[PDB]
């Protein structure tokens, strides 16, 4: 289906972002990385008090927290491209807290964070993204 290809596109964006965050060596993706990184930096400083007290011990606990935060962020019924950027900024925050405190480090299984991020974006914001220009004409033209 079209949703399969749409899912893979978003998954690649989320993977790229995580590789950018960890500095592990496309246009839309580069634009996303630039804006999400400055979102993430601001968020990490505004939330030091909160975040210093958050344990991200596994991919499972990262997922639970991601899902709870996503539910609260979007419960007012508003989707926009700026909020979509914050999903990526937040996954970047989860990936840092995870490997900061992960006891047996595993970078490959961070595919898994990218996957549940893509699942959220696709199932909850995917139809909005389509009605709002897609990544290539909605997102890029706005944030480039």
């Amino acid at each position: 289906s079209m949703t399969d290809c749409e899912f893979g596109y978003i998954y690649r964006l989320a993977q790229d972002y995580l590789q950018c965050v960890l500095q592990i060596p496309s246009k839309t993706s580069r634009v996303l990385q630039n804006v999400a990184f400055s979102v993430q930096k601001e968020v990490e400083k505004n939330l030091k008090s909160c975040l210093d007290n958050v344990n991200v011990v596994s991919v499972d606990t990262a997922r639970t927290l991601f899902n709870q935060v996503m539910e609260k962020e979007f419960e007012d019924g508003i989707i926009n491209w700026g909020r979509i950027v914050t999903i990526f900024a937040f996954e970047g925050i989860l990936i840092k807290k995870l490997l900061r405190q992960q006891i047996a480090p595993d970078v490959d299984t961070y595919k898994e964070i990218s996957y549940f991020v893509a699942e959220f974006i696709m199932n909850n914001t995917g139809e909005w993204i389509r009605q709002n220009g897609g990544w290539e004409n909605g997102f890029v033209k706005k944030f480039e």
Binding site: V39, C50, N53, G82, R83
Partner: peptide
């Protein structure tokens, strides 16, 4: 107890909406 879901969601929502206003086209 602390509800980090609320503290984080609140900040992401705020900055998401600001950034939404700061970029256009």
């Amino acid at each position: 107890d602390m509800r980090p879901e609320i503290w984080i969601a609140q900040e992401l929502r705020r900055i998401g909406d600001e950034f939404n206003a700061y970029y256009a086209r």
